[PDB]
Write a protein that binds this DNA or RNA. Structure first.
Lengths: 149, 58
RNA sequence: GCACAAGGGAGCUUGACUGCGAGACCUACAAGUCGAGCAGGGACGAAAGUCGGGCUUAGUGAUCCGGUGGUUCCGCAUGGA
RNA sequence: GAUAUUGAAUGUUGGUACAGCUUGUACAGGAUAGGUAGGAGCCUUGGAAACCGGAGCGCCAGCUUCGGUGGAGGCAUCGGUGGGAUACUACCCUGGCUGUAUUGACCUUCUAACCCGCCGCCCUUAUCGGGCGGGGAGACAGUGUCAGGUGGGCAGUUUGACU
RNA sequence: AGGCCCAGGCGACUGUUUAGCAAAAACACAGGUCUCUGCGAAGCCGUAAGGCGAAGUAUAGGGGCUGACGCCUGCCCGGUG
RNA sequence: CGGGACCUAAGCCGAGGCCGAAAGGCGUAGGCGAUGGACAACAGGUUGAUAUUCCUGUACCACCUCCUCACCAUUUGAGCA
RNA sequence: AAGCAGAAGAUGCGGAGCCGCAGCGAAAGCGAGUCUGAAUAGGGCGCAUGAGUACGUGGUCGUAGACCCGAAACCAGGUGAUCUACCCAUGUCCAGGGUGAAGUUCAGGUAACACUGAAUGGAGGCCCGAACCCACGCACGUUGAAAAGUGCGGGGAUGAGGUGUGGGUAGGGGUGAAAUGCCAAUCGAACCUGGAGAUAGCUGGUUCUCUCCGAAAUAGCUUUAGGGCUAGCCUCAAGGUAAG
RNA sequence: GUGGAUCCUGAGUACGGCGGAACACGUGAAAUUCCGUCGGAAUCCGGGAGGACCAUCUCCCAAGGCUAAAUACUCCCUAGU
RNA sequence: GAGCUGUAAGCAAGCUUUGAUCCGGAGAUUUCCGAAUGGGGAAACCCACCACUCGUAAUGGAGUGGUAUCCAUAUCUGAAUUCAUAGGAUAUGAGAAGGCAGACCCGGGGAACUGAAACAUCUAAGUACCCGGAGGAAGAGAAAGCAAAUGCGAUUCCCUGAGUAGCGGCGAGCGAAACGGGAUCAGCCCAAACCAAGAGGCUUGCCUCUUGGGGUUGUAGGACACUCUGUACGGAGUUACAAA
């Protein structure tokens, strides 16, 4: 009544049940070739590491989302003019590139797949708001501005 | 007939029936032909039902 | 064996008793039978007295094993069980 | 038979644990109101009383459920001839019900243990045995305890004395 | 190197049986019938493995009963299986 | 000649193995085992004896080349098989 | 006492223990008294009325072969189908004389058949009858020639047959055309070795002498009635005394 | 030796149900110990025993392995009785 | 240190005071059967193979060694399958199979006669007997021990307790233990936390594989940390005490 599947299979448990499991069912099938289990001290703690190892990874991921947050806010004004012209309109295309690529104007780089703006951005020059959306867990804030040339 | 994993053995006993007389009766150990690993690779060896639970992998 | 009624009829009634018991009969033993009288408390009768179940002699039996009550007894170290 | 070997599901059902709602209706309050810690508060066009039906409950007195209509309100507590006592908020319960959460019986089916005096291949020249694949069987069987039956079929003995 | 003719009971016959008291009216047999058995068999010999049945397959095997052949083989399932 | 340097039957032993409190039981491969199959010597003589054994004649089977002839072929392979 | 010394001897030394000195009650306890009982009542027992202890001899009783003789039979462990019962495998034996079936052939005969007559053919738990296998008659045998045979008859004698050789089945068993038969001259459970010196109310036998006393065959019971235990009767010893 | 902030001190075991044996103890008021069959603990604030069981108290650390000598017995080699 | 050639005492031919015959220690040879073990086998026998040697013109044949099985350690190969494994080949093995003191004690099997005046719980008994094991002793043994106060400090055996405590158709019978007195008297280690070395599954990490240190106690001991003292001239040792 104590095993650790980890590799859930229709069983009332995933990542390995730490509480009362089925018995005699694993003695010949589950354990053999299937998903070994022995929820006995030794094997337990070891799973821990992985669960243990990804407790370290949990830290990692959570903080990936929230290192990177904070990292880009105080940013110097994004001065990427989008060819403002046309008697009061623009020429430059404001969509995905200038939004994200506005970071390596010094070096750092990002991924265009993180932008957060439902509507496409009206081709203006004003305070183009850029709510950096790296991951669901963590959101950021960026800006964009157009100039005349 | 003896299993290798443990020292279980047949042990003679008696049938103490009502108005115990009582008739003799040997008691064999429980056993299974399920495969066990000795020098590689199986098979085959008998195993006690008690030892078969948990413990050594089939 | 009994009309000095133990035989029949009524009144009051439970001695149809608790501890006993000097001494004998019965005699392989086990057991069986009678008993004056002492004390505790009573019944009847005014008292005297009588009552330790039936006129007498049969109507029943071990030990072991368990059941149920009464127990200022014991109860595997000490307290209870 | 149970159990241990001893599988996975489904179906039914049980057991509980949980969430929730409704129900608890004793002269009396004022009734035909579970109580208890709080609370002096209400609630009402985020449409109130009222009715009208659906709906359940029931002490068939009443309670409730909803909505129709309605159209601006209902209270109590309190004072009270009942053990409390209510605008109520909190709590947890009485009945009931629903899900949830787990299990164990059934319930089927499958299928990797197990099972093959089944087939091929190899050991290996070998109907033994075994590997190895295939197939059928299957959570049984077989065996292991444990229990009840049947059982001269096989044993141990008795079956008196007086006369 | 056969004594025969008859008449009845029992047993079809040949055969077999208590070596060392009884050879037969006994036993057995073919036949008849019932029952069980689907193969890893029912029955078994064995704690088991193995083997018989069987290099068989319900027209085949195991067991009970009855005894060639002819005429037949009636009734009863309450009780005991 | 009979048996063994040949074979196999009933049966037995039996590596590993299958089973069994132990001892052992069972059974492959293999082996054992004639009462069977295969297999070359026949006539007279001889002693107080033993003679299809010794002997006088004629033989027969199997195997081996210091040998004697005959036929062949050098992996296009004579032959042993 | 074991034991430590000491010719494996005695004697030592070791007081661990044992028994006695006063019990009663089931115990609690109390004590020359204690118990039963409300009981300074009664009664049971013990006191009052006082000898044991350790060895030696003997009478005996218990636990052990327990006084010797004797079972049939039980269990355990082994040995044997060289006789016999049967099975398996492989060989071998059956002088001769009769009966005549199926089938076949040739003729009769039919449309073909059936059928009919001769020839041919040789089957049979067939007939007669020797080897052989048996074992029904009688007699002789019975300290026999012999632990089953002989003499004269009899049955089967080509088969459910006789028989050789080798092998198999082992005793709470095998085998058995079955009778409780057979398994080494043994069979309702074979043979030897062990438990066993089994047991036994039943049987037989207890071996030197004298002297003194001297019974009983009844009762109560008893799975007892052909045993047994107490009482009746006997004997020895110590006391009471002179009870009879 | 000083310290007790952290870790160890013998797992399918120890025990319990069922079924037996062995402990003088015959399954009962009954241990304890050793077996089979199923369940199955704490681990130092711990555990076991002290003749059911519980609390207290008193002792001891089981589920690992070693151990001479005191003791028993002679087929036998010496000597003696 | 004078006779010897066994019984065997009579017979032939010989050995020895340059010392036999004899007694003892250490050896040698040691045929064949026999656990047997090259193969088979009906015990005292047959048939071989592989190398060396003798001999033969050659075959045949004769002597010397090896060749049973299982297990253990190794070294190469190699089936379904590719790896691999099973399996096979070869080498190294005073290993193991056996015998027996009819004895003694442990383990696993294990009755019945008998007693209970029968017989079924029990007795006989865990006795006879079978098997597995050993050793000269084995078993047991250093506390989950007794036990009930000023407590005793491993087992074994002997004397006691005692025929007591108890068990028991509470029948028949069975039968302790502690304390006390003696014999002989030694007590230690393996597992587990931790350190060091080697590897290896894996996600750095990490959790077990192996080899040595560390450490083996209960008014608890040790790992860990902190103090000293040591690595000797001390102690111990082949019988436990680690091994020799």
């Amino acid at each position: 009544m104590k095993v650790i599947f980890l590799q859930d299979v229709k069983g009332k448990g995933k990542k390995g049940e730490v509480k009362n499991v089925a018995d005699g069912y694993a003695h010949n099938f589950l354990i053999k070739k299937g998903l070994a289990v022995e929820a006995n001290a030794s094997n337990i703690s070891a799973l821990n590491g992985q669960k243990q190892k990804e407790k370290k990874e949990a830290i990692a991921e959570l903080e990936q989302a929230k290192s990177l947050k904070e990292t880009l806010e105080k940013l110097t004004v994004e001065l990427s003019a989008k060819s403002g012209e046309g008697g009061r309109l623009f020429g430059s295309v404001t969509s995905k590139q200038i939004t994200e690529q506005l970071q390596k104007d010094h070096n750092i780089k990002v991924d265009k797949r993180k932008l957060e703006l439902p509507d496409g951005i009206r081709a203006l020059g004003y305070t183009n708001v850029p709510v950096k959306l790296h991951p669901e867990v963590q959101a950021v804030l960026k800006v964009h501005v157009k100039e005349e040339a | 007939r003896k299993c290798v994993i443990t020292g279980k053995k047949t042990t003679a006993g008696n049938n103490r029936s009502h108005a115990m007389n009582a008739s003799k009766r040997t008691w064999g150990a429980n056993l299974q032909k399920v495969r066990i690993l000795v020098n590689g690779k199986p098979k085959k060896v008998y195993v006690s039902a008690r030892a078969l639970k948990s413990g050594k992998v089939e």
